[PDB]
Write a protein that binds this ligand. Sequence first.
Ligand SMILES: [Cl-]
Ligand SMILES: [Cl-]
Ligand SMILES: [Cl-]
Ligand SMILES: [Cl-]
Ligand SMILES: [Cl-]
Ligand code: NA
Length: 129
Amino acid sequence: KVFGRCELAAAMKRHGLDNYRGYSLGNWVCAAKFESNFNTQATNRNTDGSTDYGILQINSRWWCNDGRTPGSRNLCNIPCSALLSSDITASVNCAKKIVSDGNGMNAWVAWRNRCKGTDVQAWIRGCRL
Ligand SMILES: [Cl-]
Ligand SMILES: [Cl-]
Ligand SMILES: [Cl-]
Ligand SMILES: [Cl-]
Ligand SMILES: [Cl-]
Ligand code: NA
C-alpha cells in the first residue's frame, strides 16, 4: 500500500506515535517519506547482507527475522515480512522499541539527514487529525 501523507499521519496518530518519546507526528511522517516514499512494500538490501523492510525500513540485522541474515537478532520478535503489510501496526510497534533504545530517531539515517532540525510540522499541515 502507498499511503497518502495525511492518511499516514492519521494512522500513525491512532497508533500512538504523536509525541511518542517526545517526537511530534511530523517527524514520523517525514521519516516515512524519505525512507520508503510512504510504500509499505519497500525493501532495500544493505552491504552487510541485512535488509530493510517496510514503511520505516526496519533492519533485519537487529529487529526482525528474515531467515537470511546470519548472526542477527530479532528484537521485535516478528518475521520481517510482517512489516510489509498494508496494516502498519507491526511497523509502529517495532519502531516504538527502536526509538526507546537510547538513540531516539537517529536510528533512521534519512530522518537524521533530511528531517532533523527542519520544520517537520509542515508534513502534517492541512491534515484532518
Ligand atoms: Cl508527499
Ligand atoms: Cl509535527
Ligand atoms: Cl537470520
Ligand atoms: Cl491500522
Ligand atoms: Cl530522544
Ligand atoms: Na534478524
